[PDB]
Amino acid sequence: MLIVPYNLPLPGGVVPRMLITILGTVKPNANRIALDFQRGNDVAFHFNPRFNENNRRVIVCNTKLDNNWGREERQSVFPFESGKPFKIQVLVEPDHFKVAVNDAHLLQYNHRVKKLNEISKLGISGDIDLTSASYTMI
Ligand SMILES: OC[C@H]1O[C@H](Sc2ccc(Cl)c(Cl)c2)[C@H](O)[C@@H](n2cc(-c3cc(F)c(F)c(F)c3)nn2)[C@H]1O
Incomplete structure (x- = not known):
């Protein structure tokens, strides 16, 4: 549905209580997916499912700072x-990003x-059919 790679603007950045919801379907024989919360060229939070490492x-x-990746x-x-549909929910909390997949807390x-x-x-980005990407304040 949506074109991947997809860019979702986050006006005024993120803040605690902001919930981001991504709906999509993993492609058959997927290798990778990535969510990148960016601060300019830096990646504040890279979330990267690898299906075959x-x-x-x-x-x-x-996190990527000045083009260097940090500690994984x-x-x-x-x-x-x-091949299966998923839902990723990223809730911004004061001290961390909290991630749930398919309503179950992940990390x-x-x-x-x-x-x-x-x-x-x-x-x-990556090996998905992207259905929707949005945010709300809880
Ligand atoms: O640490 C995280 C990084 O790990 C390596 S670089 C590396 C190697 C070893 C170490 Cl010990 C360290 Cl610290 C860094 C990846 O290459 C890097 N990466 C993935 C993607 C990418 C692009 C896509 F288009 C996409 F669809 C996708 F799912 C993924 N782009 N860049 C990122 O995952």
């Missing part, structure tokens, strides 16, 4: 499945980029 499925999260945060719970990512109001774009 040495025959393992893993979600890699990181990895955990082993992988709720996505090739938290502590804020490395501190100027939340300058994280003004969300890029969505």
